Design a protein around this ligand. Sequence first.
Ligand SMILES: *[C@@H]1O[C@H](CO)[C@@H](O[C@@H]2O[C@H](CO)[C@@H](O)[C@H](O)[C@H]2NC(C)=O)[C@H](O)[C@H]1NC(C)=O
Ligand SMILES: *[C@@H]1O[C@H](CO)[C@@H](O[C@@H]2O[C@H](CO)[C@@H](O)[C@H](O)[C@H]2NC(C)=O)[C@H](O)[C@H]1NC(C)=O
Ligand SMILES: *[C@@H]1O[C@H](CO)[C@@H](O)[C@H](O)[C@H]1NC(C)=O
Ligand SMILES: *[C@@H]1O[C@H](CO)[C@@H](O)[C@H](O)[C@H]1NC(C)=O
Ligand SMILES: *[C@@H]1O[C@H](CO)[C@@H](O)[C@H](O)[C@H]1NC(C)=O
Ligand SMILES: [Ca+2]
Lengths: 315, 322, 316, 172, 172, 172
Amino acid sequence: DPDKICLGHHAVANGTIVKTLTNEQEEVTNATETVESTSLNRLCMKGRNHKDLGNCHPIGMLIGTPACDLHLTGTWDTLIERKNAIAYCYPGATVNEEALRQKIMESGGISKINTGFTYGSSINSAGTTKACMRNGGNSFYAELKWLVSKNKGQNFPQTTNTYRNADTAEHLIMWGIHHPSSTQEKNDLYGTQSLSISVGSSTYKNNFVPVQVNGLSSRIDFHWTLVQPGDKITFSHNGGLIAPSRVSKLIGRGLGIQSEAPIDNSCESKCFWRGGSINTRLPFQNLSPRTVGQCPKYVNKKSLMLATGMRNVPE
Amino acid sequence: DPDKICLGHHAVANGTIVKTLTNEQEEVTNATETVESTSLNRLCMKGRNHKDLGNCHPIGMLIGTPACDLHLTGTWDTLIERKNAIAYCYPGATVNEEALRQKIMESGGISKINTGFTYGSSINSAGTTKACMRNGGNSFYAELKWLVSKNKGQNFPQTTNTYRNADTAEHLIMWGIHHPSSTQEKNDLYGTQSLSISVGSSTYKNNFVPVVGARPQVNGLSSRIDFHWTLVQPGDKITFSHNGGLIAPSRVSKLIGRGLGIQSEAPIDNSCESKCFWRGGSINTRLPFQNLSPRTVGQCPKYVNKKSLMLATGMRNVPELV
Amino acid sequence: DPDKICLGHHAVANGTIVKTLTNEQEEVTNATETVESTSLNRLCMKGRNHKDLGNCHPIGMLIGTPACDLHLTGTWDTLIERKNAIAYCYPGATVNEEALRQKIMESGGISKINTGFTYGSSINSAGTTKACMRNGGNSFYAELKWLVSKNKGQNFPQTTNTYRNADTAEHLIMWGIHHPSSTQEKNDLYGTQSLSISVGSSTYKNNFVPVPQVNGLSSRIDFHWTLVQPGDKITFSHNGGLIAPSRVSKLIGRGLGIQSEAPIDNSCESKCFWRGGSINTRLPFQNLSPRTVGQCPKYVNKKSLMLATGMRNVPE
Amino acid sequence: GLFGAIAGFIENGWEGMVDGWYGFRHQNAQGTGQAADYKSTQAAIDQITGKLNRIIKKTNTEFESIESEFSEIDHQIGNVINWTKDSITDIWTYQAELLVAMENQHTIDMADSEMLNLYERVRKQLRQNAEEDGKGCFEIYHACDDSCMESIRNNTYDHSQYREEALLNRLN
Amino acid sequence: GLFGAIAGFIENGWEGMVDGWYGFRHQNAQGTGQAADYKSTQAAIDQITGKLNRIIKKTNTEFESIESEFSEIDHQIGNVINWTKDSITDIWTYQAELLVAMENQHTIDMADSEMLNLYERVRKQLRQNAEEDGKGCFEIYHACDDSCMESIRNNTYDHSQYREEALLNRLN
Amino acid sequence: GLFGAIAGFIENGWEGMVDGWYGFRHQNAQGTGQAADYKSTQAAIDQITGKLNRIIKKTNTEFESIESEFSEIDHQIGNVINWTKDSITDIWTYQAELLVAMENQHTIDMADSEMLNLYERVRKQLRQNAEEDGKGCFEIYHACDDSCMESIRNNTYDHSQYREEALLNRLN
Ligand SMILES: *[C@@H]1O[C@H](CO)[C@@H](O[C@@H]2O[C@H](CO)[C@@H](O)[C@H](O)[C@H]2NC(C)=O)[C@H](O)[C@H]1NC(C)=O
Ligand SMILES: *[C@@H]1O[C@H](CO)[C@@H](O[C@@H]2O[C@H](CO)[C@@H](O)[C@H](O)[C@H]2NC(C)=O)[C@H](O)[C@H]1NC(C)=O
Ligand SMILES: *[C@@H]1O[C@H](CO)[C@@H](O)[C@H](O)[C@H]1NC(C)=O
Ligand SMILES: *[C@@H]1O[C@H](CO)[C@@H](O)[C@H](O)[C@H]1NC(C)=O
Ligand SMILES: *[C@@H]1O[C@H](CO)[C@@H](O)[C@H](O)[C@H]1NC(C)=O
Ligand SMILES: [Ca+2]
């Protein structure tokens, strides 16, 4: 009999379930995801001055292993280390290895500076090995010199070499200490004498005494220190020292990515992990708790759906 | 024609913008700030028994560098370290350096206790240097003795000194190990013999060998004195076996109570009060957040990456349109 | 004149006070607690394969102090260390002591493996002491051998022993180095000669040199340890003064390490523990201790926080 | 309150009502009666249950020790742990205080809403046959027997049936 | 719901309405008609947009590695990192679960509020010329042509014009 | 907003009203008058005070240094601290942004609620003797002198006294 006007709201056939403070199964017209589950299998290096090290291990850059020849110097904002990267062409390790790697991967480039170190004619500087191949012929670490007596068996002359840091910023000096297995090898190369190697600056001081991998029990182990601006560092040795021909300077800061995934200069990103890039605009992710850069926060959630619409009541 | 009563709410000409869950630009009658941006450039030490160390580095208090002569002892609830403070008059470092500094800066004072250590007449106790000046004449760390042979060149007598902690609370014993530059210097002072220094208690044990090597010169001296430390428990003893090269404790240190450790270049003010401090001074704000520095000490507002966060203290402002 | 129907809501005589965004003293019909204040003074080890060490210090398991005899071997998912537990029957310490303890307390068991070490007839293997008592008679660390010359005074023969790791997982080898105080004592067991002890594998290598009275003894036995990789060997060169491994240790899987003075109870279950015992509360917070282990309510600086489970209470 | 029902125009609650949270008291010729509304009571209780299911829980995360109860650890790493742990405890204390406070505010206002929602259902049902006294009662301007009351409560009251009688009584 | 409009006195929504969130259905002499209310639809959508702009973002903070993917790190510092990282993940998981849950509750109730707010605008506009059926409809007690309907929706309906006709029809 | 009083059916606020937050403007024979409602104003202010008491404070927790201002610290422990501290700052920045945003939303809606709650108190008081104009005013259908107005504001207005006069004026 009477005219009538009704107020109402829309609905949809297919609604989505979300969670509220009171209801675990609340159907609404529209929701959206807040946790990212998908990852790009590539490293998005667009608009980044990057350096993919490939088979070069960051420490190899400072001592100059063959593999790292293309990476002895440069400038970057991003540094990408790879799996099973090579630091040591001749068997050995660096003391405080991990601390050094982390320091290089925070760097935004590397300058090299000549020590200027010269040696008496009774010394052989360019001592090489079949382990470190370069131009398909026996070679050695580019930034170090293998110091051995020129006459096989002759006792090694007492030498003193000293680097001073002329620069206004700290310099990273590395050096090696050869320890052969057999007394026949040591006498042949350095002489019968007791060997002692003393290194000293204002900051640092240390003494070293030379004591089967690739068929060799003989090692070259590496040590490192920072040498302050204006300060000097002196090396006293009677043989067995692998001497720095160059010191390293780490410049500015850079993002260090450890990833097996391939480069792509077409795509951009500020967040990376082992398995690649994360360009999601979402505020959370559940891919990995180990990420680097500006990133969504890791959460222990497959999905968290955010209602973008009213309750859905069909019929 | 008809009588009428209207309900309404106040408004203001100048409203403030705040942020809600839905609106980034919401005008309300009144808001207030929640993040503190203002800082006092002074250290507010009212109602605090404080000790400004000045040129003295906290470690220097325990070994007794000249600079720290006024600060070998005392009681406090607040300890203020300064920039370029001096710990080492004679070149060297302390092993576990930072760990010790932090321990001293948590302390609420320092007692000193005599080791009572005595040495054979073939030993020289009062060995001094031009590096550590006191009364404008060659001296040494007040709390340690430089042990050297009395006859230049003579081998250093095997000695054994032992401190026992008679006290009811733990004691902090420090000692040094001299490493000279040249072998001419070591033989001259300790003798040709191989040197070995063993220190041992119930808790702790360690062996030390003076290292001889060419190194550069600090205050015209290439030789170093490096320091080591440990806690000696109540009732326990610690023994030093040495054939020369040990810098021996004449006194042990005892850290008393707890205290707030401030690292700040900023000056004191005993007129003003505060429970929160940072490099750049004090923070007295009653607000729950601040954006001055993430490095603060005491009871503090939480650091946030926000210039301002305005909290509505009034209703939506809808003004009379014109 | 007219009939009436009234709408209303329940109330109660005794309401609870809770806190809201606006009101610190809001009375409601019913609330519930969110912070747990009560703690069980026992360790609830039901449905867990546990090992209470008692007087045994975890390191003592690897060298085999008398006290640890019942715990030289086994499998577990939970390991309970106690206060003032004994590691060293003979005076000494282990270098990197705490690092080793933490490693053992993460473990889910210990296998023992024989080194197979053999010695010349000029050597005495079964050297014992009054400090380490076992079966009411002088004894020694079960997993090590005290190597001394058989003829009193005689200089100790240069010996070389080598362990190889036949297993597919890393093995934990420890050994000791005897330092006597007085040269008169050392002469009886080892000779006048300079003593030097070198141990070496692929992974690392080192040599150490023998140098106040504890349990009536001034002589010390200090211990060292390292991991020996699968397939690799470790060789021990000594001219006397080495305490030699008769067995190497192998850590199995992972396990929860509890440090607690509180007693066991196999009747009750829990996933959260602290010094003072177990925490089985279903609540999301607790204020008992910030040092807890397992799956736990989060520590909060709050005695109580009451969650309203009912409307405002407005009484008659 | 946000909705002005509970601790509002309704002067107080009923200790007498022990079969529900929200309900009715009527007054007719026959005498007086009281009854609970189930649907509105269950609505409130279900929402509070929901909160309890979400709030009364801990994480599945297994945490190991990083502090030895029975031995000293390096002083520097110890201070880092102390700082981190205290920083976390500050967060969780805050997150807890906020959660409970915010939920409490909502629990209250939610219950207020459910009362007002019942009143408004009744108001609309009675249409032009009753008037609000402003204390949460409807003065019904006709003979409403106990069957008529049960009809209001069970949402079966047809206003049209009593409309004529009611409009006369009202205009007088 | 807090406001009892959506999933309340309004029995269900309209799958048929695809030009807006809130709107009208009328029935007069001329026939039936449906139309969306723009202002009320936009109000709800703008508020939800607002939430999305705030919630869909990450921080500016650049985080470096403290865990090597390809090499072992000291066991003790590693356990500290593991503990810290797990503790942070617990917080962010909680903070995320709470945020979304709390926003969801609000988004819903906000939309409810916007429906009720439209109904109340219409109710007050029609004044004494219509009555609530309690299903979200107004029974209009006069001839309301399509121009009269468009006048209700466009907030131009002058109650005074139909008042006398309506009050007679109502009292009968 | 949620309650549609403020920035809703009430077109704007009154810069003129400086003795309260909520109040009345009347128009009768005698002339015009304005007055604040104390109880409703104090209700809103007390709730905002409450928020300020809870929000404006720091923790009791004493934090020590773990970063030396005047000396370099080990590179590895330093990176851990940097990561942890940045992670904490991200949390507290988020917790702060959410707190203030959520409180702001509530503060606003709370004040809206308190306006609507006063209107509804008056509406129910005037009963059948006035009608809503939809702008937050009641057209009173009888002679309401300044004593009659003061009676509306002071919640002492007896509808029955003017009912007869009012119902006649309304039906005409
Ligand atoms: C880390 O914090 C804890 C608890 O606040 C400290 O534990 C205290 O340690 C001292 C020993 O010097 C005792 O006197 C107290 O009784 C201890 N309290 C508890 C509850 O154990 C701990 O020392 C702090 N660590 C550092 C490095 O400062
Ligand atoms: C920190 O946690 C990581 C990940 O939970 C640990 O690495 C895992 O260790 C398990 C159990 O022993 C291995 O089976 C997995 O293969 C490892 N997973 C990954 C992804 O690395 C790591 O052991 C912990 N760090 C320390 C120092 O214990
Ligand atoms: C929900 O919103 C998103 C984002 O605007 C849109 O892509 C999607 O089509 C919407 N879904 C529905 C069913 O309207
Ligand atoms: C940690 O951050 C501070 C502040 O930017 C910086 O100065 C310092 O070098 C950082 N430490 C390390 C080890 O990167
Ligand atoms: C309330 O206001 C009216 C205004 O006329 C006044 O007459 C009455 O006495 C007041 N009541 C009280 C208790 O103040
Ligand atoms: Ca501390």
